[PDB]
Design a protein around this ligand. Structure first.
Ligand code: ZN
Lengths: 333, 27, 52, 421, 126, 225, 116
RNA sequence: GCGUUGGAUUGUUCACCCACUAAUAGGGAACGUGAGCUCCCUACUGAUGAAUGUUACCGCAAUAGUAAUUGAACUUAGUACGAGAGGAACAGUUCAUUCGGAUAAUUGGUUUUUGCGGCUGUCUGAUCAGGCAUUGCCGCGAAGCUACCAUCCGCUGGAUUAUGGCUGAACGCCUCUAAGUCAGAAUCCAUGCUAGAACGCGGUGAU
RNA sequence: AGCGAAACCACAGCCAAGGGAACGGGCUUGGCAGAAUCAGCGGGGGCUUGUG
C-alpha cells in the first residue's frame, strides 16, 4: 500500500479539519474561504460536453455527481492569530452574545441534565456600550496576521436528528485586518448564504472522514479539484428543472434520498464522489490557488437531472409520472 | 561513506603486516 | 514524460493564472456584499417590527 | 539490402572499442568477491564475466559485418562504384579480418571457461579471468589498422547518394566546366557549384524531376580526360540503364578545345554505343559532324539564358526513354473566385478565425451563427427537448394546433354524452 | 474508456469474407503489465491472432486483428450499456486496410470512429 | 479545381465528409483546417454543415444525398436532426429512415439523377429514395463486392470504381448511369475509392497521398477542366 | 436525448438506466431493467406475462387505439423551429396528458362495471 | 526520483529463441521468505488508558511519513530540414496505461428482507393454513458483503548537480572561479497530503 | 459466572557501532526512554573490480 497515508488510524472526530487555507489577495475585499455541509447520496447527470479539442466535443455525456446538503451558516465569533517563531498562536477569540441552542449544545456532552448556563456571564460582559468586548476586538485589530471566523451548522433546518451544531474555523482572505474584523463585527449572528461562497462551474476541494468498516477505514481524506455543477436554493421551487428540461421537480428523488431526507434548503452538486458517506459532515475549501486548465475554464450546460428513486429501481421521475403511466388503481377509486 | 575507527583486528593486523615487512627487507 | 514537479507544466500553468477565474470570483464577491448584506437589512426590518 | 546506406552503427577506433566493452564487463556485472566464499561461487563469478565480455566484442562485430554491404553481392554498378572510391581488396580483407577476429573472441571464451571450472584456489581463478580478457584485448589491439579505415568508409558510404538503376535515369556528362552545373541548377532543385576551375564536383550529383506524370532522375558526372575520379565517370554510363547527355561548347569558354571533345567521343565509344546518345551544344563547323559518324547522334544549337530551349532538351530526352439529360452546376460557385493564400484582402476562413482567438485545440467550434433560420434573433437556441416522460420531438410538428382543435371538438362531443359520472 | 471481455486465449469468430472462421488470441497490442494477471482486450483493439479453422492461405500465419464484437456489457457516454451476441473479430494488415471486402454482423460504434476503413468496409453499423 | 487536404492526418476524406451540389457535411473536432479547405474552395455560396451523426465523427460513409434531399440513419439523434434543418434551405429535404442497416454511405451511391443501392434492402427504402431525391433507383453490385458506395464515387460528369472491375461490368453499368466509367485507384493504390475521395460536378477532394498519375485519371473522367 | 419505450415493458427507459442488446440481425433491443432482460434470455413471450403493457394493449385492460395516443407517433420530418410553434407545445402536451388520463379513467369505469 | 514481461525445455536445467512494451539494468540483505516450496522474549499494525484546577469547545505544529507514472492523438506540418526518399520539435490541447486515494449512480459472484410466485418429500376428515425439509429446488429481488468487473480525483515555489555563461584575477595576454555573479536535472528542500508529542503549547465557555 | 492444571524457571530482555578469537545478553561510545493494558501477523530467536 501507499506509505504517505500513515499512520492509517482513526480520525480525531466525525468532523475532519481543514489542514491548509487559501493564501491571500490583498486587493480583494473580505471573503470567506470555505463552507460546510452534509453528504446526501449520489445522482446521475447528463450534459453536452462543450470541451474543445475533444473526442466527446458537443456530444451528450453521462456522469455520477454527489449532492451535499449545505444550509446557510451562522457566525458566532471571530479569532486573531499572531505569527510566532513557533508558528501561530491564537491570542484572542471573541464571540457574539446571542448564541443558539444548537451552538451551546456543542459545549455540553450531556445537554439534558445541564442547567444550560453557558455563555451567560460572558453575555453580561457584552451588556454595555462595549468596553471589554470592543477592547478584545482592538486587540486583534492591532496584532495578528490571519483572522478566522467561528461558525456553526444550522442543524434544525437539516433532516438529521443529531441536533448538535458543528463548530468549524474558517479564515478570511480579504485584504487588510482592519477590514477583516469590521466585516466580522457586522456579520455576528447573521446567517451566511452558500451561493455567496461558491458559484457554478468552479473547482473546489472537499474534506470528509471516510466510510468506516470494521483497523481499516475512518480516516480524514481531502480530495482536490472537483467541479461544482449546481448551486441550488431552497426557496426556489424546481431545482431539478434545467434550462432544457424545465419540468417542475426537485433534485430529491421520490421519497427522499437514500437514508437521507428531503432537501428543503440550499445544496451543492459536485462532480464525482466526495469521500465518506451520507450524513457525514463535509467542509468545502476553495482550492488554494488558481488552476487555469481547460478542465477548469469550461462553463457547463446541464441538460437533465435524474430524480428517479434509487431505493430499489426508478422507472419514473415525479409522482405525476406514476399515474400518467399506470392510469388509476384500486385504492384511488 | 567510509569510517575512521580502526577495528582492533586491523589495528593489530597492521603490526602483523609491518612485522612481515621487517623480515622481508633482511632477506 | 514530465512530472507534476517538472519545469514544463510549472511555467505553462503560471502564464494563464490571470484569466477569467480571477474575475469570476470578483463577480461573485459582489453577491457576498449583496444578499448577505441584505440579511443584515432584513433582520433590521424585524428589529423595526420590534421597535414599533 | 536497399540502395540507401545511412543506418550504419558507428565504429569506435580500437582503443575506444576496448573501453566500451572492457568497461561494460565492470559496470553491468558483479565486481566484488570474498576470499572465504565457496569455490563454485568464485568459479561462476568469473565465468559470468569472461562469457559476458566474450559475447560483448562478438555483439559489437555482429553490428559491423551485418551493417555494411558485402561489395560483390550487391549490384554490377555498385560493386564498381565502391571500387572506384575505395580499394575493393582492402575492403574485402576488412570483411575477413573482422570475420577471423569474431571467431577468435569466441575461441577465447570457449577455451578459458573450460579451463576456469578446474581452477581450485582464488589466485588461479582470478588470474585466468585476467588471462581471458588479456587474450581478447590483444585481438582488438591488432585491429587498430582496419577499424580506422572502416571509420572513413562509415562516413563516405553514409553520405553517398541512393540511385536506382531501374528508374528512368539520364547521365549529364562532358568536359570540366562546360556548363553542366548551370544545366542541372535550373532544370531541377539540386545545389551544384558553378565555379571557374577544373574538378568542381568530385562526385555524382542526382537531380530528381517529373515529366508526363512519370518519375525521372538526372545524374551529373565529374569529368573525363587512369585516375579514380576519372574511372567513376566512365563506369557511370557503362553500368546504368541511361541515356548519355554529352555537352559541348561553341565558344572561347570552358578552356578546353572543341577538337578535344571529338577525340573524347571516339575513344570512349566502346561502352555508350548501346545506350542511345543525346548531344547538345551550348574546319570549325565541319568537325562537329565527324561526331555524327557514330550510329546514335543528335546535334542542337542552344541558348541557356532563356528557359524554353533548355527545357526542350528535357522534352526530347523523355520521349527517348519511353520507347526503349443535363448535369447541374449552381451559378454562385462559378461567379466566386478561386482561393488565393497570399492575398491581403479576402474572406476569412476558420483557420484564420480560430487563430485570432488563439490556438487550435482551445477554441470550441461554435455551431451557432452558421445556420439559416427565418428570423436571426433566436440564433441562441434553447429547445425544451423533454416534457415529463415524453420527449418534445414525438409531438413536435407544424400545424399541430389545428390537430389539437380536432381533439378539442372531440371533447365537447364526449362530455355531453356522460362518460364522467 | 471501454470495458474488457476478450482475454489472452479467447476464441473470437470471423466477421469478414476472407476465408477464416475463428481467431485464437495470443497477445494484446498496447497492454499494461499487470501482476499475477494476463492483460485483456476490448472493442477496436488490435490483437495478435492465429487462425484455427479456415484456408491454407490464411493458416500457419501470425497476424494482427481488430475486434468488432465484444460480448461483455460495456459503457457508452450516451447513458445506456450494451453488448453483442458473440465475441468476434476481423483481420487486417498493420495500416488498417481490410482484407475482407464486406463485413457480416454488427460493428461497434467505439471501433468505427477509431478506424476509418473499418467505417467504410462495414455492412451494418451498430 | 481538384484539392488535396486532410482530416486528423487520415487519407480517408469521404468517411469524414459528404459533398453534394447544394451542400457539404463536416464533422466537428479539434481541427478546423478540414473545414477551412472546403471554406476556401466553396465559399459562402453553398452551405457547409458542421454536424455529428448519432454522436460520431464518421459522417460521409453513414449518410446519402444530392441536390433535392438528404438521407440519415435510424441511429440519428433528435438534436443532430434539429440542427440539420436549422441550416439547409427548402430546396433540400431531410428524412430519417427506419432500418436494419445504418451504413447509408456504404449502400447508396447517388447523384442528382441515378441511385445505386444494395440488393438486400427493404422495399420501403426504394419507394422513399425515388420520392424525396427525385432519382431512379437500382439494385446492383460492382465486381462481386456488395457495398457499392464504398467502392464507387459518383457524380453527374463521371464515376470511379475500384481497379478490380471487369470490362463487362464497366460498359454495361455505364449504360445505367448514361456516363462512362473508369476503374482506377485513389490514395496511393487503395481499393476503397468512394470513401477515399469526395466529388460533385465542379469539385474533387482527395487525400494527401493521392499521386499525380491518380489525379490525372480523376481530372479526365470527372471533367474538371 | 430520446425516451425509449422498452421492448419487454414498453415503459420509459432513461439514459443510464437499463441494458440494450444488439442481435446479429441488428436492431435495438432496449430494456428498462435487468429483470425484463433476464426474462428475454429465457425466450418468454411479452404478451403472455401480465405486468407489462404488451398484454394490456392486446387483451382489453387499457385502451390501445385513441385520438390522444396517435399524437405520440415516432416523428420523422425535421422542422425549422419557431419561438412560438414550440411555445404552444408546452401547453399542448399539458392539455393532452389531462385527456389521456380522463379517457383512461372513462375506460376504467367501463371495465369496473359488472360488480354492481 | 519512478519503472523493469510472457511461452516450448527438468536422464543429473548447469543451453536458447519470436511475442509485446518506453525499457523489459545488474546486485546485496548467507543456511534471505527449506519449521510459504519441487502457553521462552520482543519488533511491528492498531486500540484504550491514570496523571499534570476540573470539564468542554475551537486550534497551533515540534516531529515522522509522503506520490504519482508512462505513452499516443489533434494543431504547430507535410513547415523547418533534404537531390528525393523521408520527416521534427517548443508553445496550445485530448485521452489512455500502471500505481494510489476515494466512491455505489449503473454493472456484477452476491442474500439467512431466509422478500414474493411455482413445484415436491410429508400430511392435518378435504378445500384453506404451509406445520416441517442439517439453509428443499427454480424464477427474480431491494438492503447489505463487495470488485478494473465499474465512476471521480491525483500540486507549485525555492535551492542545486552535470552543463552553458557574465565580470575577472592569479600570471602587464587569456581563462565560467580564486573573491564575485546569471540560468539550469524526473534531484534536493519547501508548498500541498497523513498523524499529532499520550510528560509540546494557546485561546475561549461554566461556579 | 463457577471449578482449575502442567511443562518450564540463574537473572533480565530497545536499537547503532566497537568490543581481536566462526562469543555477544550484561561492558565502551551514542540514539534514546514516562505509569497501566487489550487485539493482530504467523515476523525474527581494510579482502575485491579492466586490459594474459
Ligand atoms: Zn421492462
Amino acid at each position: 500500500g501507499h506509505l504517505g497515508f500513515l499512520p492509517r488510524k482513526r480520525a480525531a472526530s466525525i468532523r475532519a479539519r481543514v489542514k491548509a487555507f487559501p493564501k491571500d489577495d490583498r486587493s480583494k475585499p473580505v471573503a470567506l474561504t470555505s463552507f460546510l455541509g452534509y453528504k446526501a447520496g449520489m445522482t446521475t447527470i447528463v450534459r453536452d460536453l462543450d470541451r474543445p479539442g475533444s473526442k466527446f466535443h458537443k456530444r451528450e455525456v453521462v456522469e455520477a455527481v454527489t449532492v451535499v446538503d449545505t444550509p446557510p451558516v451562522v457566525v458566532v465569533g471571530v479569532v486573531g492569530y499572531v505569527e510566532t517563531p513557533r508558528g501561530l498562536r491564537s491570542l484572542t477569540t471573541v464571540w457574539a452574545e446571542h448564541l443558539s441552542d444548537e451552538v451551546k449544545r456543542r459545549f455540553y456532552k450531556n445537554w439534558y441534565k445541564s442547567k444550560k448556563k453557558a455563555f451567560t456571564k460572558y453575555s453580561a460582559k457584552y451588556a454595555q456600550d462595549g468596553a471589554g468586548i470592543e477592547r478584545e476586538l482592538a486587540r486583534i485589530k492591532k496584532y495578528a496576521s490571519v483572522v478566522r471566523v467561528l461558525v456553526h451548522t444550522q442543524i434544525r433546518k437539516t433532516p438529521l436528528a443529531q441536533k448538535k451544531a458543528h463548530l468549524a474555523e474558517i479564515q478570511l482572505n480579504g485584504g487588510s485586518i482592519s477590514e477583516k474584523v469590521d466585516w466580522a463585527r457586522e456579520h455576528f449572528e447573521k446567517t451566511v448564504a452558500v451561493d455567496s461562497v461558491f458559484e457554478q462551474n468552479e473547482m473546489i476541494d472537499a474534506i470528509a472522514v471516510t466510510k468506516g468498516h470494521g483497523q481499516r477505514g475512518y480516516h480524514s481524506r481531502t480530495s482536490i479539484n472537483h467541479k461544482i455543477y449546481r448551486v441550488g436554493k431552497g426557496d426556489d421551487e424546481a431545482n431539478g428543472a434545467t434550462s432544457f428540461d424545465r419540468t417542475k421537480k426537485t433534485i430529491t428523488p421520490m421519497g427522499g434520498f437514500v437514508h437521507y431526507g428531503e432537501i428543503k434548503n440550499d445544496f451543492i452538486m459536485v462532480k464525482g464522489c466526495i469521500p465518506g458517506n451520507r450524513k457525514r459532515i463535509v467542509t468545502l475549501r476553495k482550492s488554494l490557488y488558481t488552476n487555469t486548465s481547460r478542465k477548469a475554464l469550461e462553463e457547463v450546460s446541464l441538460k437533465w437531472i435524474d430524480t428517479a428513486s434509487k431505493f430499489g429501481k426508478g422507472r419514473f421521475q415525479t409522482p405525476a409520472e406514476k399515474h400518467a403511466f399506470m392510469g388509476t388503481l384500486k385504492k384511488d377509486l | 561513506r567510509q569510517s575512521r575507527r580502526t577495528s582492533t583486528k586491523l589495528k593489530e593486523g597492521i603490526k602483523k603486516k609491518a612485522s612481515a615487512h621487517r623480515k622481508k627487507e633482511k632477506k | 514524460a514530465k512530472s507534476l514537479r517538472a519545469s514544463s507544466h510549472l511555467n505553462a500553468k503560471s502564464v494563464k493564472r490571470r484569466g477569467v477565474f480571477q474575475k469570476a470570483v470578483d463577480a461573485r464577491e459582489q453577491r457576498i456584499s449583496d444578499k448577505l448584506k441584505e440579511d443584515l437589512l432584513k433582520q433590521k426590518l424585524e428589529d423595526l417590527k420590534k421597535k414599533e | 539490402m536497399q540502395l540507401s546506406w545511412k543506418d550504419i552503427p558507428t565504429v569506435a577506433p580500437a582503443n575506444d572499442l576496448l573501453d566500451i566493452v572492457l568497461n561494460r564487463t565492470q559496470r553491468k556485472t558483479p565486481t566484488v568477491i570474498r576470499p572465504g566464499f565457496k569455490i563454485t561461487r568464485i568459479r561462476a563469478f568469473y565465468m559470468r564475466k569472461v562469457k559476458y565480455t566474450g559475447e560483448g566484442f562478438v555483439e559489437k562485430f555482429e553490428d559491423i559485418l551485418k551493417g555494411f554491404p558485402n561489395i560483390n553481392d550487391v549490384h554490377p554498378f555498385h560493386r564498381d562504384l565502391m571500387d572506384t572510391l575505395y580499394e575493393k581488396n582492402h575492403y574485402k580483407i576488412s570483411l575477413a579480418a573482422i570475420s577471423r577476429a569474431k571467431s577468435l573472441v569466441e575461441q577465447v571464451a570457449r577455451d578459458y571457461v573450460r579451463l576456469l571450472k578446474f581452477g581450485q584456489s582464488l589466485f588461479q581463478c582470478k588470474q585466468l579471468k585476467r588471462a581471458a580478457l588479456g587474450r581478447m584485448a590483444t585481438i582488438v589491439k591488432k585491429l587498430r589498422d582496419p577499424l580506422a579505415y572502416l571509420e572513413q568508409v562509415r562516413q563516405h558510404i553514409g553520405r553517398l547518394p541512393s540511385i536506382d538503376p531501374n528508374t528512368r535515369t539520364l547521365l549529364i556528362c562532358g568536359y570540366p566546366n562546360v556548363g553542366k552545373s548551370s544545366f542541372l541548377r535550373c532544370i531541377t532543385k539540386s545545389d551544384v557549384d558553378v565555379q571557374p576551375y577544373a574538378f568542381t564536383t568530385k562526385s555524382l550529383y542526382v537531380g530528381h524531376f517529373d515529366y508526363k506524370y512519370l518519375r525521372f532522375q538526372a545524374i551529373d558526372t565529374p569529368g573525363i580526360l587512369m585516375n579514380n575520379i576519372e574511372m567513376q565517370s566512365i563506369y557511370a554510363i557503362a553500368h546504368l540503364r541511361s541515356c548519355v547527355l554529352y555537352f559541348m561548347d561553341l565558344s572561347e569558354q570552358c578552356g578546353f578545345t572543341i577538337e578535344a571533345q571529338v577525340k573524347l567521343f571516339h575513344s570512349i565509344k566502346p561502352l555508350f554505343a548501346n545506350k542511345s546518345v543525346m548531344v547538345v551544344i551550348n574546319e570549325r563547323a565541319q568537325l562537329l559532324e565527324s561526331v555524327k559518324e557514330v550510329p546514335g547522334v543528335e546535334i542542337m544549337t542552344s541558348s541557356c539564358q532563356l528557359e524554353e530551349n533548355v527545357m526542350e532538351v528535357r522534352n526530347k530526352a523523355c520521349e527517348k526513354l519511353l520507347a526503349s439529360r443535363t448535369p447541374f452546376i449552381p451559378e454562385s460557385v462559378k461567379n466566386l473566385k478561386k482561393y488565393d493564400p497570399e492575398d491581403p484582402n479576402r474572406r476569412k476562413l476558420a483557420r484564420d478565425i480560430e487563430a485570432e482567438n488563439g490556438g487550435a485545440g482551445v477554441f470550441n467550434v461554435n455551431l451557432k451563427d452558421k445556420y439559416l433560420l427565418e428570423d436571426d434573433e433566436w440564433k441562441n437556441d434553447i429547445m425544451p427537448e423533454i416534457l415529463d416522460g415524453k420527449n418534445v420531438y414525438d409531438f413536435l410538428d407544424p400545424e399541430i394546433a389545428a390537430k389539437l382543435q380536432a381533439l378539442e371538438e372531440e371533447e365537447e362531443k364526449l362530455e355531453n354524452e356522460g362518460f364522467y359520472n | 474508456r471501454i470495458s474488457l471481455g476478450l482475454p489472452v486465449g479467447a476464441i473470437m469468430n470471423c466477421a469478414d469474407n476472407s476465408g477464416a472462421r475463428n481467431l485464437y488470441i495470443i497477445a494484446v497490442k498496447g497492454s499494461g503489465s499487470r501482476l499475477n494477471r494476463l492483460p485483456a482486450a476490448s472493442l477496436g483493439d488490435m490483437v495478435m491472432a492465429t487462425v484455427k479453422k479456415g484456408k491454407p492461405e490464411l493458416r500457419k500465419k501470425v497476424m494482427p486483428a481488430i475486434v468488432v464484437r465484444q460480448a461483455k456489457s460495456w459503457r457508452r457516454r450516451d447513458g445506456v450499456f450494451l453488448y453483442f451476441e458473440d465475441n468476434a473479430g476481423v483481420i487486417a494488415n498493420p495500416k488498417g486496410e481490410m482484407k475482407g471486402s464486406a463485413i457480416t454482423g454488427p460493428v461497434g460504434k467505439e471501433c468505427a470512429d477509431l478506424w476509418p476503413r473499418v467505417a467504410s468496409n462495414s455492412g451494418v453499423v451498430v | 479545381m481538384a484539392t488535396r487536404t486532410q482530416f486528423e492526418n487520415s487519407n480517408e476524406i469521404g468517411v469524414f465528409s459528404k459533398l453534394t451540389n447544394t451542400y457539404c457535411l463536416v464533422a466537428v473536432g479539434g481541427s478546423e483546417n478540414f473545414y477551412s479547405a472546403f471554406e476556401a474552395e466553396l465559399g459562402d455560396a453553398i452551405p457547409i454543415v458542421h454536424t455529428t451523426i448519432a454522436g460520431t465523427r464518421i459522417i460521409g460513409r453513414m449518410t446519402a444525398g444530392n441536390r433535392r434531399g438528404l438521407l440519415v440513419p435510424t441511429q440519428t439523434t433528435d438534436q443532430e436532426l434539429q440542427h440539420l434543418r436549422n441550416s439547409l434551405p427548402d430546396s433540400v429535404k431531410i428524412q430519417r429512415v427506419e432500418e436494419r442497416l445504418s451504413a447509408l454511405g456504404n449502400v447508396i451511391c447517388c447523384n442528382d439523377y441515378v441511385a445505386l443501392v444494395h440488393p438486400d434492402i427493404d422495399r420501403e427504402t426504394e419507394e422513399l429514395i425515388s420520392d424525396v431525391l427525385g432519382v431512379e433507383v437500382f439494385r446492383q453490385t460492382i465486381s462481386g463486392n456488395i457495398l457499392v458506395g464504398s467502392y464507387c464515387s459518383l457524380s453527374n460528369q463521371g464515376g470511379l470504381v475500384h481497379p478490380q472491375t471487369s470490362v463487362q461490368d464497366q460498359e454495361e453499368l455505364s449504360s445505367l448511369l448514361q456516363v462512362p466509367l473508369v476503374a482506377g485507384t485513389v490514395n496511393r493504390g487503395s481499393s476503397v475509392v468512394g470513401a477515399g475521395m469526395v466529388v460533385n460536378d465542379y469539385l474533387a477532394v482527395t487525400g494527401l497521398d493521392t499521386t499525380a498519375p491518380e489525379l490525372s485519371v480523376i481530372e479526365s473522367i470527372f471533367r474538371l477542366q | 436525448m430520446r425516451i425509449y419505450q422498452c421492448h419487454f415493458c414498453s415503459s420509459p427507459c432513461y439514459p443510464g438506466h437499463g441494458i440494450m442488446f444488439v442481435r446479429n440481425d441488428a436492431k435495438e433491443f432496449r430494456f428498462c431493467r435487468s429483470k425484463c432482460h433476464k426474462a428475454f434470455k429465457q425466450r418468454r413471450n411479452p404478451r403472455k406475462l401480465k405486468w407489462t403493457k404488451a398484454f394490456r394493449k392486446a387483451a382489453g385492460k387499457e385502451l390501445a387505439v385513441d385520438s390522444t395516443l396517435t399524437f405520440a407517433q415516432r416523428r420523422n420530418v425535421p422542422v425549422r423551429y419557431n419561438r412560438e410553434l414550440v411555445a404552444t407545445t408546452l401547453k399542448a402536451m399539458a392539455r393532452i396528458e389531462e385527456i389521456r388520463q380522463k379517457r383512461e379513467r372513462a375506460f376504467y369505469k367501463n371495465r369496473m362495471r359488472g360488480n354492481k
